[PDB]
Write an enzyme that holds these catalytic residues in place. Structure first.
Site, PDB file in Angstrom:
ATOM      1  CE  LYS D 154      -3.040  -0.670   3.329  1.00 15.91           C
ATOM      2  NZ  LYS D 154      -3.633  -0.701   4.727  1.00 15.91           N
ATOM      3  CD  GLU D 180      -0.717   5.410  11.036  1.00 18.16           C
ATOM      4  OE1 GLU D 180      -1.451   5.289  10.433  1.00 18.16           O
ATOM      5  OE2 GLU D 180       0.444   4.375  11.144  1.00 18.16           O
ATOM      6  NE  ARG D 181      -1.960   0.074  13.290  1.00 15.72           N
ATOM      7  CZ  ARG D 181      -2.617  -0.994  12.705  1.00 15.72           C
ATOM      8  NH1 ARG D 181      -2.135  -2.082  12.967  1.00 15.72           N
ATOM      9  NH2 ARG D 181      -4.000  -0.872  12.663  1.00 15.72           N
TER      10      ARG D 181
END
Ligand SMILES: Nc1ncnc2c1ncn2[C@@H]1O[C@H](COP(=O)(O)OP(=O)(O)OP(=O)(O)O)[C@@H](O)[C@H]1O
Ligand SMILES: [Mg+2]
Lengths: 463, 48, 509, 464
Positions: D154, D180-181
């Site tokens: 991705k 987000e991580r």
């Protein structure tokens, strides 16, 4: 400084007090008109309290004075209760005259501390084939009985009762929790004709009383078991005692009933959010200790045979074995009528049971489950079209099922009430031989309604 | 042998079709159950 | 004797040094460890609170006229009128390497009966994750002693990986065994237990003591007989102790128990606060609740280490690996709480009931269990040798249906099926029997070399064990070197294959 | 005098009072006096009472504490220097490399674009990836549905997209990390850096370690960034056309559900916020082209529970224009990217859009790929040589097609050598048409693998 009836709605009660004088939680409140009693549930400020009625919900008048005891609920305990049946309040309901002792103790102690866990796991044997082979018990354990309506479950419990009583001076105790009083009376009389009540204590909650009473019968039985275990006899270690729960699910439902009226919001199923709190409170006071132990048996009901919702889910996180009864095995004429393939225990471990017994259990699991899955094709074609392999397997499975047929020690009338209580080692021997095939040459009937290899061989020779 | 082979192929195909059917209905039912339970919860909370 | 008398007197003269002008409050309302209090206009958000009975409380709802706070100790001792008092401080618990071999309360209070604990340092339980700029990639592996785990699901120092499954599936056993394998890792470990039977807790304690590994280890448990708030906060405290060493540049491992259970407790607490409920009664912040916890564990950039130490340490980089556990209802993944959990971890592992019911010990379903961190969390040799298992297990799981079949099928399918069946059986394993990476290495080599593609399936485990002992005795220096380094070299593989073919030539299985 | 004082605090929601002669409007910005936390007006409670949310942690705070306003919604820095910079939702640097260079500030909110500014044309973005360029052409100012699990590149695809748009169309790139991580965010940063593309993109992350409001407003933040860049006109007018990357809009909807619940408002059918469609749209309409400049969107999409009839994906499809899906098997077959050239759907797939011949060509390719797909099972089971030789020709030709759709990437150059190849239409079209004519049925499949245009393919084939 006496409170008065200020508002009543169904099962929830409220009282006004002088703000200086305020009752603490869990202390009894004396209706000044009747014997009925109230337990504090929460303090509403301004001298206002919320309570639940222990006893009848009749005769109640707004503005009736009520007094307290300023102390938690305490009931008498001691050997002066054995063979007697008490109410939730510890009063004689058997018309056998008043209780003899004054040893009264409260009911809301804390769970036993961490440092006082019995520093070693233990084991309990019952002399019963399917159980002592596939449902081992730890002294202090937690046992669940699921389903079973074509058989006498109470017969099974009474068999265990005779087991423990003859096995140990450790007495027994049962608590009626939403009791189907027909079965309760039957059990009462059958224990009576057994002449075994000296090791038994009786409290009943029988689906006729405000939810608090049926809630609290559990605490009553707990307290009796605790104290009785704590009586250190001549050695410094009292007897290990046994408990009988009429139904854990009704214990959950008792709190479930009035939770919302308490102002509690519903839970994921609409339940009481304090479900887990009360559950743990109940279970953590049931353990094995450094000195003595307490174990219990819980008659379990399952709603619609569904386990995937909180009400059995929470329970399961506290049991140690799941004895699930079997109906069509009873239809097969089997006395115990206990399923041999679904019931388990967390106690099935080689380190605790030794290796040989564990591996025998493994093998019998394998053979029975493999025999089950061949039923369909056997029906379709027949034994012949199967390879010669597994024919002996079918025979051995059938003989296993026969071997499990155990004549009851105490029914008084089922086959003559013969006890077996065969040693675990002898049964290990017999099942080892059967798995090996030592006797895979005899009709399964010779293994039916009997115990060890001696009985099987004698039966086979007599016929 | 040929006929049995073809019949097995057709059986596989019908199985796939039924799988689609069941999956769709399962989604609908899950949605409905969630709706019912959340309505229950909000009503009960609104009670106080 | 008289010693304490002097001690108590000298201590006493140190007090009543002045009169306090403190601001406090009083009780208005009590229900189930929840208290509405009046007063205390000024108050830190989430201030820890003291009460006349010596107990403590946690303030959550600062409404415009009163305060709601939750009992931390045991209520059923408090009545309206008694006076509260804030501490002028936030919730704080002690940390320190002296905590090893010690078991404490979620508040950090000994329960091991080992007396007081001399923690030189305490810290606030609630903090924030460091700046994302202070993150550097993960490359050092973490060993589990589980060939399937260590092969298909690598685990790197500082990674968040989720064990999940249904009930009574050995998940507890998985965590503890992973803990055991840390004889040589040099890391420390913390176990967090939530809502458990003290019996089970003590059994785990005793077993660990038998292993003796309760020396680089610390554990806290919020059993089922504890105030809900204690349980709710406990994982944060465990995270605090972990972050201690992480910020010391150290690498460690921590494990939660039943994050679902503590979520339940938090649900109950919030509900008693008359907060607006969410779906399944769950306040929305449960996502926030868990997420603000998990991210606190990671592997940090050594630059962050250096600057925090202010020069004290400069070489290493801190790290902390997170191993939580979630129990599921009938293996659902669509439940709200697990759904929230999933997008948080760096990888997940499932447990399938049937396999353990089929006696597959362990019962991991590799078919869906993944670790998106790639081979970077394996050693070079395992990184090399994983692919054979990967592809063989693949092929098997697509076409395992032919078990009873292949009495007329092509031979290549039969050979591949036998390969697959054997390698599948290979992972069956017992608890408390961790495999050193050398053991795993010899097993995989024998696998890919097909030297087990000629032996019956029923004795594969026996074959493996015999091989294990054989090398362990004969060629100890080789495995010594291997697990010293974990490198794949032609000399190494040649030695291994020579040993294997010797073993086959030598004593049978 | 705007100083107001805290009156009540629960969780994250915050209440303040002000004077009944000076009351801030909704969505105004409140800075707590003496601390760096910020408050966001949600609904006027009358009596000078306002209920707001906080932006970050809420600790230690106590009532009666003074707070000022800004009399305006949130404004953040915007400008050319914003590239290669990671800021919070408040547009405040977290890269820790000095403050933001620009002094240009713009409020986050503005009304929807005028009906008058909707460009009276609709044309296609040129990309050099040779797959979407035929099957799912992008409109100019469209929304591209993207699906598939991680580990399939991705990030790589995003890399290439950015490279191409900035290179040919001089596009500028903005990326927003919703929920987000941190670890993958940092990895993405390092990738931005190694691959020399960081200098051209503006980066903002909202982590799942933050209260929901942060995560909700990073969206509008990046949106406004893009708006400023587009409306920033070029020489002779005609500001750039830019691409926007946003992760997991489903997470956005979830955070919206979060804040709606915290307000104490009843859920929706499934339980989302009842206002769901409102915020979804408010996001959408500011995504379009104009008579000056254009904006296009790439949005990571996750379908929880695989429900194509769930309200959130349903509302998503209300604005989706093209769908792209990523495969696991195709990548495992060593084909990159792993775009399934059979599920991707484009609203722009019409002879009135790509033209007549292009449309028919694409339809024919689709037919061939289908036809071969149902061929596959028979090839597996009943052998191969038991079929029509025309069907075998179809098999070979489809295999050539699949071998061909993958290509080297200019971003792949630094990865594994092998510099990528930019390819427009009118050669892809011609080559594919000739392949359909079967004029290349004399060549092994290898010449089509990891290669640019058909001229390159023939060059390799002759050289092979
Ligand atoms: N590989 C193995 N070999 C032999 N026994 C095992 C193996 N793995 C697990 N067990 C046994 O299975 C038992 C049950 O596992 P465990 O209690 O860890 O499940 P659990 O999911 O933690 O239970 P709960 O859901 O109640 O927490 C353990 O007592 C352990 O002894
Ligand atoms: Mg467990």
């Amino acid at each position: 400084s006496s409170g008065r009836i200020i508002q009543i709605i169904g099962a929830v009660i409220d009282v006004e007090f002088e703000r200086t004088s305020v009752p603490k939680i869990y202390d009894a409140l004396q209706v000044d008109g009747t014997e009925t009693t109230l337990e504090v549930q929460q303090q509403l400020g301004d001298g206002v309290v919320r309570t639940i009625a222990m006893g009848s919900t009749e005769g109640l008048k707004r503005g009736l004075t009520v007094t307290s005891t300023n102390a938690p609920i305490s009931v008498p305990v001691g050997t002066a209760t054995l063979g007697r049946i008490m109410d939730v309040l510890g009063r004689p309901i058997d018309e056998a005259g008043p209780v003899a002792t004054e040893e009264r103790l409260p009911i809301h102690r804390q769970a036993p501390s961490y440092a006082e866990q019995a520093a070693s796991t233990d084991l309990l044997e019952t002399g019963i084939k399917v159980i002592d082979l596939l449902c081992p018990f730890a002294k202090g354990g937690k046992v669940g009985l699921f389903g079973g309506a074509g058989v006498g479950k109470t017969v099974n419990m009474m068999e265990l009762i005779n087991n423990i009583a003859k096995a140990h001076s450790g007495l027994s105790v049962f608590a009626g929790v939403g009791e189907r009083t027909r079965e309760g009376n039957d059990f009462y009389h059958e224990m009576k004709d057994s002449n075994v009540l000296d090791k038994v204590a009786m409290v009943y909650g029988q689906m006729n009383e405000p939810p608090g009473n049926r809630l609290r019968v559990a605490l009553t039985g707990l307290t009796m078991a605790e104290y009785f275990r704590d009586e250190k006899d001549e050695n410094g270690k009292g007897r290990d005692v046994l408990l009988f729960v009429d139904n854990i699910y009704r214990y959950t439902l008792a709190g479930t009933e009035v939770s919302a009226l308490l102002g509690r919001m519903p839970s994921a199923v609409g339940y009481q959010p304090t479900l887990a709190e009360e559950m743990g409170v109940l279970q953590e006071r049931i353990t094995s200790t450094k000195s003595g132990s307490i174990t219990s048996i819980q008659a379990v009901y399952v709603p619609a045979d569904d386990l995937t919702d909180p009400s059995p889910a929470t329970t399961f996180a506290h049991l140690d074995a799941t004895v699930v009864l079997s109906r069509d095995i009873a239809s097969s004429g089997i006395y115990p009528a206990i399923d041999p393939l679904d019931s388990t225990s967390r106690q099935l471990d080689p380190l605790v049971v030794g290796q040989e017994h564990y591996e025998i259990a493994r093998a019998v699991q394998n053979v029975l489950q493999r025999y089950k899955e061949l039923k369909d094709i056997i029906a379709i074609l027949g034994m012949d079209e199967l390879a010669e392999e597994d024919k002996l397997v079918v025979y051995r499975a059938r003989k296993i099922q026969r071997f499990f047929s155990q004549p009851f020690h105490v029914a008084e009338v089922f086959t003559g009430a013969p006890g077996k209580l065969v040693p675990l080692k002898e049964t290990i021997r017999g099942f080892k031989g059967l798995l090996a095939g030592e006797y895979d040459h005899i009709p399964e009937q010779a293994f039916y309604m009997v115990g060890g290899i001696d009985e099987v061989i004698a039966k086979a020779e007599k016929l | 042998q040929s006929a049995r082979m073809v019949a097995m192929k057709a059986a596989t195909d019908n199985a796939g079709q039924l799988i689609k059917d069941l999956q769709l209905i399962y989604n609908k039912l899950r949605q409905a159950a969630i709706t019912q339970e959340i309505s229950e919860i909000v009503g009960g909370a609104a009670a106080v | 004797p008289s010693e304490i008398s002097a001690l108590i007197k000298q201590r006493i003269g140190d007090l009543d040094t002045s009169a306090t002008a403190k601001n406090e409050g009083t009780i208005v309302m009590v229900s189930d460890g929840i208290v509405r209090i009046h007063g205390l206009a000024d108050a830190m958000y989430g201030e820890m609170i003291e009460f006349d009975g010596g107990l403590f409380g946690m303030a959550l709802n600062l409404e415009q006229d009163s305060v709601g706070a939750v009992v931390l100790g045991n209520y059923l001792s408090l009545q309206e009128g008694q006076k509260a008092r804030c501490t002028g401080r936030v919730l704080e618990v002690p940390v320190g390497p002296e905590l090893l071999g010690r078991v404490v309360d979620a508040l950090g209070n000994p329960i091991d009966g080992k007396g007081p604990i001399d923690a030189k340092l305490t810290d606030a339980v609630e903090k924030v994750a460091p700046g994302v700029i202070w993150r550097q990639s993960v490359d050092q592996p973490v060993q589990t002693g589980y060939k399937s785990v260590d092969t298909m699901i690598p685990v790197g120092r500082g990674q968040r990986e989720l064990i999940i499954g249904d009930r009574q599936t050995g998940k507890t056993a998985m965590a503890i065994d992973a803990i055991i394998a840390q004889k040589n890792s040099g890391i420390k470990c913390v176990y967090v237990a939530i809502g458990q039977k003290q019996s089970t807790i003590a059994n785990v304690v005793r077993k660990l003591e038998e292993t003796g590994a309760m020396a680089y280890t610390t554990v806290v448990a919020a059993a089922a007989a504890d105030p809900a708030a204690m349980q709710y906060l406990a994982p944060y405290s465990g995270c605090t102790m972990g972050e201690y060493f992480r910020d010391r540049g150290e690498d460690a491992l921590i494990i939660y128990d039943d994050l679902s259970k503590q979520a339940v407790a938090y649900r109950q607490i919030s509900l008693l606060l008359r907060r607006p409920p969410g779906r399944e009664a769950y306040p929305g912040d449960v996502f926030y609740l868990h997420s603000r916890l998990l991210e606190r564990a990671s592997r940090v950039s050594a630059e962050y280490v250096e600057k925090f130490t202010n020069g004290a340490v400069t070489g290493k980089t801190g790290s902390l690996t997170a191993l939580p556990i979630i129990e599921t209802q009938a293996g659902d993944v669509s439940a709200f709480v697990p759904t929230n959990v999933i997008s948080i971890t760096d990888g997940q592992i499932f447990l399938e009931t049937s396999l353990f019911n089929a006696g597959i010990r362990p019962a991991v379903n590799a078919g869906i269990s993944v670790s998106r961190v790639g081979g970077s969390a394996q050693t070079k040799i395992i990184k090399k040798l994983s692919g054979g298992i990967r592809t063989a297990l693949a092929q098997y799981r697509e076409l395992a249906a032919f078990a009873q079949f292949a009495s007329d099928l092509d031979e290549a399918t039969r050979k591949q099926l036998e390969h697959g069946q054997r390698v599948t059986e290979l992972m069956k394993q017992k608890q408390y029997a961790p495999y050193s990476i050398a053991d795993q290495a010899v097993s995989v080599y024998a696998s890919n070399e097909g030297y087990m593609a000629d032996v019956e399936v029923k004795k594969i485990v026996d074959f493996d064990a015999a091989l294990i002992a054989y090398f362990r005795s004969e060629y100890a220096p080789l495995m010594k070197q291997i697990d010293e380094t974990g490198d794949y070299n032609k000399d190494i593989e040649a030695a291994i294959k020579a040993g294997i073919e010797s073993f086959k030539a030598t004593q049978t299985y």
